[PDB]
Amino acid sequence: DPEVTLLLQCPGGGLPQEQIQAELSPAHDRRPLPGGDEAITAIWETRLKAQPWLFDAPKFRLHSATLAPIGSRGPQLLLRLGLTSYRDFLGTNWSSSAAWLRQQGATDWGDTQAYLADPLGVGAALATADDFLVFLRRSRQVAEAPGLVDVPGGHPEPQDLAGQLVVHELFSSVLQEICDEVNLPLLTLSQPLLLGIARNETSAGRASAEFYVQCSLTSEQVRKHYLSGGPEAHESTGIFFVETQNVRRLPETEMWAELCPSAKGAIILYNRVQGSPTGAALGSPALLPPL
Numbered sequence: 001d002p003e004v005t006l007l008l009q010c011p012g013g014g015l016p017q018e019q020i021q022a023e024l025s026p027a028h029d030r031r032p033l034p035g036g037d038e039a040i041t042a043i044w045e046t047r048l049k050a051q052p053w054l055f056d057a058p059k060f061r062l063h064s065a066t067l068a069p070i071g072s073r074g075p076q077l078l079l080r081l082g083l084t085s086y087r088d089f090l091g092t093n094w095s096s097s098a099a100w101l102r103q104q105g106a107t108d109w110g111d112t113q114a115y116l117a118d119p120l121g122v123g124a125a126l127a128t129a130d131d132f133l134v135f136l137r138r139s140r141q142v143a144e145a146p147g148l149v150d151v152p153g154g155h156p157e158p159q160d161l162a163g164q165l166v167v168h169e170l171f172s173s174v175l176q177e178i179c180d181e182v183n184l185p186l187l188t189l190s191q192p193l194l195l196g197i198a199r200n201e202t203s204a205g206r207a208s209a210e211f212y213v214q215c216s217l218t219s220e221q222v223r224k225h226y227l228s229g230g231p232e233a234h235e236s237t238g239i240f241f242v243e244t245q246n247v248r249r250l251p252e253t254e255m256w257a258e259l260c261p262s263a264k265g266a267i268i269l270y271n272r273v274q275g276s277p278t279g280a281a282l283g284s285p286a287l288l289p290p291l
């Protein structure tokens with residue numbers, strides 16, 4: 001799977017909100033492009049002159065994420081974040097020249113990402129009461145990853161002493177994206193756990209935070225809520241469910257080639273952090289069948 005890299009695997013089966021610190025600093029921003037940010041402005045003008053209904057939006061930028069020594073007391077993760085935008089993403093990560101910007105950043109800053117917007121995404125491994133995970137089919141008419149399988153998620157928009165409000169917005173945003181696209185009541189969802197962070201090498205290394213969320217509804221009830229919105233209530237074109245039993249070997253299935261990179265990251269991290277038991281009971285052969 002060369003199109004996804006793991007940046008972070010969380011300990012303890014995943015981290016809750018109260019164990020994460022954020023540092024939001026202009027030191028964590030993208031560096032100005034070598035020949036100037038006029039190249040980003042030119043791409044944006046070309047795009048608005050064809051699609052004048054498009055609008056910019058601010059985004060969080062991932063600089064890095066440092067885990068505490070395992071088994072320690074106190075905060076377990078530090079997220080180093082800056083600010084970016086949907087315009088800066090289109091002019092850098094989405095540019096045909098994105099590989100040239102990665103080489104230049106290695107040369108100039110010793111950092112392949114230094115000249116890239118790198119907006120932070122969020123995604124969820126969303127489990128039902130009857131032990132399935134939730135998948136969504138992407139429209140074949142989008143420009144990115146057309147027709148591929150996704151999980152619920154999105155790219156959160158801004159508004160430890162500004163830090164704790166930023167961590168709150170990240171955790172809130174993954175629940176809001178489930179409510180908006182799957183049409184589930186907020187009170188049927190658990191507080192999220194952070195499983196880790198995955199990078200999309202097909203989009204010049206931009207990262208997504210991947211979370212585990214439990215729903216109190218069955219697969220049949222989730223399907224009814226999604227469909228009862230009608231075609232205008234969702235961006236996806238369909239919903240479907242895979243037993244958690246069968247997610248373990250998903251990389252060996254024909255479904256794997258249809259999954260977009262950020263969804264592959266969610267499933268790899270679900271399998272390593274929520275699956276993969278360490279104790280004698282769940283590790284016994286009848287409960288963890290060999291192969």
Ligand SMILES: CC(=O)Nc1ccc(C#N)cc1
Binds near residue numbers: 144
């Ligand atoms: C939703 C989608 O198709 N992809 C996407 C959208 C916005 C950003 C940003 N900024 C990055 C990727």
